[PDB]
């Protein structure tokens, strides 16, 4: 949890500055759309009482964190597979290769994928992601938890995503850019440099979500 420490310090710092508790607030001056995430979670399915958590990333790949802490990942070609065991052992194969050891888990991934496809809305479909690297690994879901107000999704690339149940607003925090992308209730998205929010301030609603984000990151570090 090296990236989480950076994110905590970053969030602690912005909240301490009290960005909404100022007379002059100019959050537009803190916008940096050069910092849009490469990846975020566009769909999720919590079936952890039986199977685990399934999700979609913005690139159309899918994953499932099974209850046994194994992970299956379908790349956006809908065929290429990455299997990650508890100890970290990874395997690269295909749905069509038909490996008998994994058919139970592959079948489940298809159910998750189908449920998301025909039932659920794709978050940030109106956002173009940042390019990235052709060599870099596909991120996966490291860990997650739900509160009564939000789901918290921590990816292996260090990004933390928080979705709020009440009003559909979402936060995407990247510690590498020290940046936050905010999707409001009207589905508008803005990316802010956190250090610039300390100087220019932001509206009341973003500030309170940055306050909540910090609590959640505390929970993440504190679960180790």
């Amino acid at each position: 949890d090296c990236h989480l420490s950076d994110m905590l310090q970053q969030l602690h710092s912005v909240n301490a500055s009290k960005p909404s508790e100022r007379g002059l607030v100019r959050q537009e001056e803190a916008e940096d759309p050069a910092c849009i995430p490469i990846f975020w979670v566009s769909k999720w399915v919590d079936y952890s009482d039986k199977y685990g958590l399934g999700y979609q990333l913005c690139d159309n790949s899918v994953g499932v964190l099974f209850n046994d802490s194994t992970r299956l990942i379908l790349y956006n070609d809908g065929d290429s597979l990455q299997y990650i065991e508890r100890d970290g052992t990874e395997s690269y194969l295909t749905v069509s290769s038909h490996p008998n050891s994994l058919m139970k888990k592959i079948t489940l991934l298809k159910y998750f994928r189908n449920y998301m496809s025909e039932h659920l809305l794709k978050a940030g479909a109106n956002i173009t992601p940042r390019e990235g690297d052709e060599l870099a690994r596909l991120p996966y879901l490291r860990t997650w938890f739900r509160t009564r107000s939000a789901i918290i999704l921590h990816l292996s690339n260090g990004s933390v995503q928080i979705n709020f149940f009440q009003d559909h607003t979402k936060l995407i925090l990247c510690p590498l850019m020290a940046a936050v992308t905010y999707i409001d209730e009207k589905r508008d998205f803005r990316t802010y440099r956190l250090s610039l929010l300390e100087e220019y301030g932001c509206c009341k609603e973003l500030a309170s979500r940055l306050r909540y984000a910090r609590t959640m990151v505390d929970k993440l570090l504190s679960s180790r």
């Binding site: 399915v45 079936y47 039932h119």
Partner: peptide, 9 residues
Amino acid sequence: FDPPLHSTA
């Protein structure tokens, strides 16, 4: 396949 919880349907 009826999951109890999920993102915005």
